[PDB]
Symmetry: C2
Subunit: 280 residues, 2 copies
């Protein structure tokens, strides 16, 4: 059970000297969904860019399938086929073409025939509800529409690992729920997911494991439920628990539960508890 | 007349023909905080770009202080000084220079002294905890840091009206709380706020009024608590009440809230009410 991806002791400063990763290590079990959380500037984006080989560290290394990645053209090509990335700014990921052309580029560049590439593209467009935008120039789109196009282009590649940098920023509710359904489906099909987010509710909905970043290091890592219900540890990266868990931890302290009972984590669970409560 | 801004019957299609605003009317009372919500592509950004005179409609008009604006160079300059806009994409708003210089340009272009400009810059940077980035090149920043710099540049100009296009996208929790504090202070000083967002919790925390956009038109507008608790109307733009408000409504359903008090509209407010609950 070697992880599919492992960051080992990554240290990276940008040209110009700004330090971004400081001895960062993080292992990603195959088939898991890993949420990465932490403050602006903690190094989440830079870490994702190391995991698909966009950036190379000054020290440390990334392992893919248990082996050090290698830095050749064939190496990097194989690496990027296996590990896809949806950038934080979707506009940076788009080409000056129509939506269909944009999403087609990847599968075609994979040396796929016209037919298998076509099927990939059509399914990706449908999965993100942008089929009707196929002939739209990518610049003639709203921010949330652009986000869908960028995600569709990545998913059309069917990578072994999908990295997403703040995938739901700017998405409307319908789009967020549709993306959740898609990502759950891809995971069920065996895909590994790593996503940065400031949405702790998204982490709660999608992650098996959670890593908290601060100042270029992993401050804490564990199963999603254990980390997301830990008020003191989350506070060290200036986060609160997901709202229902937040309140429900408060309820447990206040003596509203049992005691002996499990913590309500859903709206439904909390609603059921409320019927046994009154005002003082 | 009385509202500080009024969109009257705005119709706009982009070059190339994509329709964006469809006979849209929206009035903004001076001093209010207005949230604009609605699906990706609904026309939220396009409307904001009409309100500060960036885009000119094919039909309809914008009134500023009850007066039709006009489109001369000097009309536009005066309009933009009175109505600032934080763009949806921070990179579109940042100059290729240091953070301090970027934020200083607005005040300096207003004809203020270097001493006044300096004070405005330092106040804006400190409000969003980025004083220590003053000499950082704006490209050498994370997405959330860039968001803070763009907001700082707009608030340093101290406009009559501040428009914010999805200002918390990519922002961490601390940044969001600091933005709320900043915006509350600016409004107390008399500033009018209009913000587009997909974060309905932000709307709950910050808005006096909420407008719901659908396919280029205002579907509904009203007092924030009324709109954000209106399950039926929210469903028409594929929204639900914010989780805090859902839980507050749920609490009221079980009589756990103030006979007649306004709903808790923030996590802290909901948590406070919890202190007064006991088991049956
Ligand atoms: N530069 C551009 N050229 C052409 N059409 C554009 C455009 N920018 C946006 N559009 C189109 O104009 C309409 C309104 O887009 P707008 O960006 O105002 O929506 P919005 O701000 O509500 C969406 P989002 O929440 O996704 O940011 C949509 O149909 C969109 O595809
Ligand atoms: N292109 C660039 N050049 C130089 N420094 C950069 C940079 N992009 C980011 N940085 C810096 O690198 C560090 C890590 O930033 P990174 O963008 O990886 O973090 P992050 O993704 O956790 C933040 P966010 O939540 O704001 O998107 C910060 O100190 C940031 O200012
Ligand atoms: Mg980032
Ligand atoms: Mg927009």
């Amino acid at each position: 059970m070697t992880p599919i991806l492992a960051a080992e002791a990554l240290t990276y400063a940008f040209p110009g000297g700004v330090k971004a990763l400081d001895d960062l290590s993080l292992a990603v079990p195959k088939g898991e969904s890993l949420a990465i959380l932490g403050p602006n500037g903690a190094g989440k984006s830079t870490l994702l860019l190391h995991l698909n080989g966009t950036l190379r560290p000054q020290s440390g290394r990334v392992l893919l399938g248990g082996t050090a990645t290698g830095h050749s053209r064939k190496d990097l090509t194989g690496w990027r086929r296996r590990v896809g990335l949806v950038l934080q700014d979707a506009d940076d990921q788009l080409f000056a073409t129509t939506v269909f052309e944009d999403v087609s580029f990847g599968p075609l560049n994979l040396g796929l025939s016209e037919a298998e590439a076509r099927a990939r593209v059509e399914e990706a467009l449908a999965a993100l509800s942008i089929s009707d935008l196929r002939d739209r120039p990518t610049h003639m789109l709203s921010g949330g529409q652009k986000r869908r196009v960028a995600i569709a282009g990545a998913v059309a590649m069917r990578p072994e690992v999908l990295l997403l940098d703040q995938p739901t920023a700017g998405l409307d509710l319908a789009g967020t729920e549709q993306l959740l359904t898609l990502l759950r489906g891809l995971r069920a099909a065996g895909m590994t997911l790593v996503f940065s987010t400031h949405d702790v509710e998204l982490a709660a909905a999608l992650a098996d494991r959670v890593a908290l970043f601060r100042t270029g290091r992993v401050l804490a890592e564990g199963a999603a439920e254990a980390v997301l219900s830990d008020r003191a540890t989350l506070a060290k990266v200036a986060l609160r628990p997901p709202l229902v868990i937040d309140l429900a931890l408060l309820a447990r302290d206040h003596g509203l539960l049992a005691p002996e009972a499990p913590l309500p984590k859903t709206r439904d669970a909390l609603a059921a508890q409320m019927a046994g409560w009154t005002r003082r």
